[PDB]
Paper text:
In the nucleosome, two copies each of histones H2A, H2B, H3 and H4 form the histone octamer, which wraps about 150 base-pairs of DNA on its surface. Among the histone variants, H2A.Z is known as a universal nucleosome component and has been suggested to function as a regulator of transcription. H2A.Z is known to accumulate around transcription start sites (TSSs), which frequently contain nucleosome-depleted regions (NDRs), especially in transcriptionally active genes. Intriguingly, in mouse trophoblast stem cells, the H2A.Z nucleosomes around TSS regions convert from homotypic (H2A.Z/H2A.Z) to heterotypic (H2A.Z/H2A) after DNA replication.
As the H2A.Z nucleosome with a histone H3 variant, H3.3, at a TSS reportedly has different physical properties from the H2A.Z nucleosome with the canoncal H3.1, we also tested whether the incorporation of H3.3 affects the structure of the H2A.Z molecule in nucleosomes. To do so, we crystallized the homotypic H2A.Z and heterotypic H2A.Z/H2A nucleosomes with H3.3 instead of H3.1, and determined their structures at 2.93 Å and 2.35 Å, respectively. We then found that the H3.3 incorporation minimally affected the H2A.Z L1 loop structures in both the homotypic H2A.Z and heterotypic H2A.Z/H2A nucleosomes. Therefore, we concluded that the H3.3 incorporation does not directly affect the structure and stability of the H2A.Z nucleosome. For the heterotypic H2A.Z/H2A nucleosome with H3.3, the tagged H2A-H2B dimer, H2A.Z.1-H2B dimer and H3.3-H4 tetramer were mixed with the 146 base-pair DNA, in a solution containing 2 M KCl. The diffraction datasets of the heterotypic H2A.Z/H2A nucleosomes with H3.1 or H3.3 were collected with an X-ray wavelength of 1.1 Å at −173°C on the BL-1A beamline at the Photon Factory (Tsukuba, Japan). The Ramachandran plot of the heterotypic H2A.Z/H2A nucleosome with H3.3 showed 98.1% of the residues in the favoured region, 1.9% of the residues in the allowed region and no outlying residues.
Numbering used by the authors:
A (entry chain A): 38 to 134
B (entry chain B): 25 to 102
C (entry chain C): 11 to 118
D (entry chain G): 16 to 119
E (entry chain D): 32 to 124
F (entry chain H): 34 to 124
G (entry chain F): 19 to 101
H (entry chain E): 38 to 135
The structure:
DNA sequence: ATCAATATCCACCTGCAGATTCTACCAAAAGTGTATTTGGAAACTGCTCCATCAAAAGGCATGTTCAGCTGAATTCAGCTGAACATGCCTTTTGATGGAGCAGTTTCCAAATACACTTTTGGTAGAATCTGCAGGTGGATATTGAT
DNA sequence: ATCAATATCCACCTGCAGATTCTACCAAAAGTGTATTTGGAAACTGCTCCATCAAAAGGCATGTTCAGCTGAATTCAGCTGAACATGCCTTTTGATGGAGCAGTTTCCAAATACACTTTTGGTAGAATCTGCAGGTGGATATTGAT
């Protein structure tokens, strides 16, 4: 049969998703998530379709940017695997925590 | 609903961020990070909505909210 | 005509409502300014001033000082989660830093 | 004839920009006669600079229309435009870069 | 020439929270910078709010919303209380 | 509801007569122009107030540009601004 | 009058070490001191450039504290205590 | 001949300087630096004393804050020694240089 | 690197579907023609306060010596995370029809602006007030070698 | 374990540089009057939004292997910390000399004001094309192996 070694498909996915621009989180779960969070401030608010779109564009752009800095922290520790400690370091430098 | 943000979804975000290998603890950590980010943005966006005496959150409310935290977003009216 | 009554006293404030109103007017923040706007703003500025002074005053006492110095202001802000958040991009001159040594650096 | 944008040799609206400057700089404030012209010229320059680099990429990918992706590539590909615009370009993605320690 | 400052008002507030405590000139300068900073933040946010909603008037409502945007949590609740109280006391002639 | 769409499209035809632009890319250009305008106007506003002036002139815009634009962009922007004002004041 | 040269080297090794100590640093590589001097100069260049810009706009030949304070605020480095 | 072990005095210095607030860079050499840099922009500039003092407060606060992040990057790589590599990482995540 | 052998890209194409471009109102708004006012430049001038010098003390940078211990390689395996195929489904797509809530007018009582005329809280400078910086000590750890 | 050597903690002291309080003049809030906006408060719109719902179409969750990554462990060269003498140079304080803020007065070039007409740009459908769907035929590119 055929079997790709660990890292080959991973490197392939990186090239594929860095080349494209589409949203990577499914819309309905994100929309549902936004509404739950919002209702803890104000129950049953109306949301424009573009409003959720803006929130998702920002959310993904934020996380992608965080994963970049997270990756840098992993590499700095001579690792290839990102860990919670990498995220925690990146967010600390940013002033997020 | 925070579990609705699936592992392969979080994975795709990491790939675009150029991450090759991912710890299993990352996904729960990412969901926690995403929630705080959303809470802060939505808290401000809803605040803009109430001031306008509206019951509908517009895209401009979000843009204004993102701008206030130094997370300027292009392409949604403002 | 009637005896002068300051807007601050009318609002029960220590911060000058009139001066704040003038500053809103000459900053050209808007074409028109409401009557209650400088009242509200002066009250907020006064309370936030009180909050920092309270905690800074406390820090001076535990250092057994009767005079607040920048160090006390810094100790007050960085030890309070919400004041630290509010002034997270602000440098306090002669404030120094909060004592903090990473555990891994300490001896065995 | 003749519009203020025409007399300054611009495509960007001097009149609208003048009115915008006249907004939050109230009637108690003032706006110079050439301030709008100068401001218009800067906006048009920056717009042209971004459009040129973006237009190049759209043709370098054999596409007739400029897309958000082309704008993102043009900005992050230019040192000064990149530092100027730390905003999030919607639907622009990221610039393809893999760290050299990740490649076998 | 006269240079205005918030010094006398900060000192009045100081005597209210710590009647025994004084303050150095450099620490007073920091308090003045603080008051001017918060003023600038709130007024600026209220200005944009009016502009966003196409209002020509900055009222206490714009100030309140700006406060809820700029102050992080319990500080916002307490500031709104002091703000509302001062207004209600002021509008009570 | 105002927009810079027409003017962005006109400039595009100057630098790329053969090239079009997507609707979403236009919205980005609109956001860009609005953002830069706010930055410059805001800085120009502060410049005037710092110097106790009530008038925003092209001199305030120029200084604001020098503060906001990073290097070569600043030089050319200042040149384009001066160039446009000179041509404007001619007629 | 007198010429100012090479003053970034006036930022001594013990001075940089003291800064690191307040930063909580326990051990310092030898290459840090040149790097710190480089980082500092870039920072000072950026802040002073804007400050002088405010000075030139005001048609002054004297940099004021407010020029510096304004320059620091524009770069997201708000400083308290100088007016 | 008494001799403290490596790191002992270093930790001692950390607690001393984290306890105090005084400027760690000498005033006069810092003044020369500011004047040198500024006169490279505009010749024959004068300085208010408070202007230079403002720059020093801001400069030291910036460097101290940077050494904090730098330290965390070093610890992250399981080191006790800060290196240029650590500074470059800290400033990169800050968005100061990439 | 051959040699062969799968698994994926990935650019030569195509044909409508759906975005863009083009069209045409028509109210918003820019432009115009005058008339009037005014912020702010300019020309002094007073007076901070800034630059530079000087010395003198002593705090502290500098340069050196040296070994403690750290960073850098290096090795190894336990185990975690990647690759994968397979069923189950949550999300996706797409109407249908209500509808809730945008935004839009047209009136006035309430609110705010802006000037005049007085008054007083706020400031500058002088006069007092007095923490605490900087000095001196034992006491209490803390440290590193027998 | 004990000690010796050292540093830090903490309390003492006072006088003077810095902080507070006092004193009057006056800049600017306050009171009072018009004139001018403004934002509700009705009574009405067509519109994106919510809700199913009906399936259905990719997309996730799941378990099983095993490749290889991370972390522990080991070794050693040499760099960096610690301690010291030496003496340069920062700190402190005072002096001049005067450049140049900042105050002040005049008065036009440069702004606003206003009542109009002319021009323009936002808008929604029609009219136009451009990619987005996919779809290969065919090298990449990876993989196990001789
Ligand atoms: Cl971890
Ligand atoms: Cl009000
Ligand atoms: Cl002008
Ligand atoms: Cl390094
Ligand atoms: Mn109290
Ligand atoms: Mn030079
Ligand atoms: Mn005048
Ligand atoms: Mn080690
Ligand atoms: Mn194995
Ligand atoms: Mn009085
Ligand atoms: Mn002491
Ligand atoms: Mn007077
Ligand atoms: Mn008139
Ligand atoms: Mn037209």
């Amino acid at each position: 049969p055929h079997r790709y070694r660990p890292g080959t498909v991973a490197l392939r996915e990186i090239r594929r998703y860095q080349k494209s621009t589409e949203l990577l989180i499914r819309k309905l779960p994100f929309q549902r998530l936004v509404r739950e969070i919002a209702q803890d401030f104000k129950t049953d608010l109306r949301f424009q379709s573009a409003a959720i779109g803006a929130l998702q564009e920002a959310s993904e752009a934020y996380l992608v940017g965080l994963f970049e800095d997270t990756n840098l922290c992993a590499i700095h520790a001579k690792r290839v695997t990102i860990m919670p400690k990498d995220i925690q370091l990146a967010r600390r430098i940013r002033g997020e925590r | 609903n925070i579990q609705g943000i699936t592992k392969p979804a979080i994975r795709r975000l990491a790939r675009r961020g150029g991450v090759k290998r991912i710890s299993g603890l990352i996904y729960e950590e990412t969901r926690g990070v995403l929630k705080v980010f959303l809470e802060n943005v939505i808290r401000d966006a809803v605040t803009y909505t109430e001031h306008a005496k509206r019951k509908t959150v517009t895209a401009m409310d979000v843009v204004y909210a993102l701008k206030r935290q130094g997370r300027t977003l292009y392409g949604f009216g403002g | 005509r009637a005896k002068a009554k300051t807007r601050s006293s009318r609002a029960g404030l220590q911060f000058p409502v009139g001066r704040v109103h003038r500053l809103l007017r000459k900053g050209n923040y808007s074409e028109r300014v409401g009557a209650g706007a400088p009242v509200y703003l002066a009250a907020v500025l006064e309370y936030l001033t009180a909050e920092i002074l309270e905690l800074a005053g406390n820090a001076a006492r535990d250092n057994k000082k009767t005079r607040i110095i920048p160090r006390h202001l810094q100790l007050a802000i960085r030890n309070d989660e919400e004041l630290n958040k509010l002034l997270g991009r602000v440098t306090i001159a002669q404030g120094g830093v909060l004592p903090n040594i990473q555990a891994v650096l300490l001896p065995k | 004839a003749v519009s203020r944008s025409q007399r300054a040799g611009l495509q960007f609206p001097v009149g609208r920009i003048h009115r915008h400057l006249k907004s939050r700089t109230t009637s108690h404030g003032r706006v110079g006669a050439t301030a709008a012209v100068y401001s218009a010229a800067i906006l048009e320059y920056l717009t042209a600079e971004v459009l040129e680099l973006a237009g190049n990429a759209s043709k370098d990918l054999k596409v007739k229309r400029i897309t958000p992706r082309h704008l993102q590539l043009a900005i992050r590909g230019d040192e000064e435009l990149d530092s100027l615009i730390k905003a999030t370009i919607a639907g622009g993605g990221v610039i393809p870069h893999i760290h050299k320690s990740l490649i076998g | 020439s006269r240079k205005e400052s918030y010094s006398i008002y900060v000192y009045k507030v100081l005597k209210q929270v710590h009647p025994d405590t004084g303050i150095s000139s450099k620490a007073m300068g920091i308090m003045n910078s603080f008051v001017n900073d918060i003023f600038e933040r709130i007024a600026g946010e209220a200005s944009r709010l009016a502009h966003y909603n196409k209002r020509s008037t900055i009222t206490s409502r714009e100030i309140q919303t700006a406060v809820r945007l700029l102050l992080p949590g319990e500080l916002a609740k307490h500031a709104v209380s002091e703000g509302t109280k001062a207004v209600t006391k002021y509008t009570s002639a």
